[PDB]
Amino acid sequence: APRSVDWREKGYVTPVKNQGQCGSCWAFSATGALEGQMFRKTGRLISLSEQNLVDCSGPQGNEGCNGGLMDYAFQYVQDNGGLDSEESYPYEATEESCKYNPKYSVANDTGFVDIPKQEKALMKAVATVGPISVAIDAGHESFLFYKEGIYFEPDCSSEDMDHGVLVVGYGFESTESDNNKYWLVKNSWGEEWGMGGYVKMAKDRRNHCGIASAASYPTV
Ligand SMILES: *[C@H](CS(=O)(=O)c1ccccc1)[C@H](CCc1ccccc1)NC(=O)[C@H](Cc1ccccc1)NC(=O)N1CCN(C)CC1
Numbered sequence: 432a433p434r435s436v437d438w439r440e441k442g443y444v445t446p447v448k449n450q451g452q453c454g455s456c457w458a459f460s461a462t463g464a465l466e467g468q469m470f471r472k473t474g475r476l477i478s479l480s481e482q483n484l485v486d487c488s489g490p491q492g493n494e495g496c497n498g499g500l501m502d503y504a505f506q507y508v509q510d511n512g513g514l515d516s517e518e519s520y521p522y523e524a525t526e527e528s529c530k531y532n533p534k535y536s537v538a539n540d541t542g543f544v545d546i547p548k549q550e551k552a553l554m555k556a557v558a559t560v561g562p563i564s565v566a567i568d569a570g571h572e573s574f575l576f577y578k579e580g581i582y583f584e585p586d587c588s589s590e591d592m593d594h595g596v597l598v599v600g601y602g603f604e605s606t607e608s609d610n611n612k613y614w615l616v617k618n619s620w621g622e623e624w625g626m627g628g629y630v631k632m633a634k635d636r637r638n639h640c641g642i643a644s645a646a647s648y649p650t651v
Pocket residue numbers: 453454455456457494496497498499500501566567569570592593594595645
């Protein structure tokens with residue numbers, strides 16, 4: 432596998448969005464992976480509607496602004512037979528009754544695949560599939576005030592995660608006596624958080640913050 436991957440430079444990744452005051456991270460993670468897979472399929476990078484997912488994927492098990500699962504979001508897109516564009520169905524950071532319009536559907540998926548809970552398996556997936564939906568333990572003050580560098584949190588859990596994000600690549604910063612490897616992770620907290628909306632999560636450091644424990648991607 433490549434020692435460095437960054438799917439943003441390959442056109443797979445849309446700009447950083449902002450979930451606002453709503454626990455819809457799962458929606459932004461799922462649209463991220465679907466935007467990447469649709470781009471691979473059609474050569475078109477189109478922004479997908481998280482609001483469509485928040486309002487409409489309740490039957491699949493999601494809870495709107497109270498949380499959800501990326502896999503349930505992929506199931507909605509399969510069950511629904513489509514997903515509206517971000518332009519047609521813009522994000523409002525609130526829960527509202529479903530407004531899906533089949534006329535504005537710009538994406539489909541045929542299911543999803545769950546990656547084994549090993550960082551090696553996640554790496555090969557990022558290297559060959561594209562951006563990957565993952566969940567991490569982001570429930571700490573250091574994550575909230577992260578600005579730059581490789582994030583490492585000693586109290587992070589490898590099993591208990593609360594935040595759905597998107598891995599768009601990986602790399603390494605090399606010092607004299609250490610290759611400090613990282614996951615390139617796209618947050619949904621606006622572009623003023625972290626590195627323009629991005630965080631470098633510690634990689635190959637015992638599944639730090641659970642990043643390999645709930646990884647999946649949609650199939651198109
Ligand atoms: C998004 C993350 S967040 O809002 O940025 C956040 C919040 C707190 C701490 C860290 C990060 C949401 C937040 C859900 C939430 C709502 C209201 C109050 C507190 C939290 N997180 C989720 O949607 C997660 C995603 C996820 C996917 C896979 C594995 C682990 C987590 N899921 C989630 O919270 N739930 C709710 C309970 N339900 C049974 C499952 C989905």
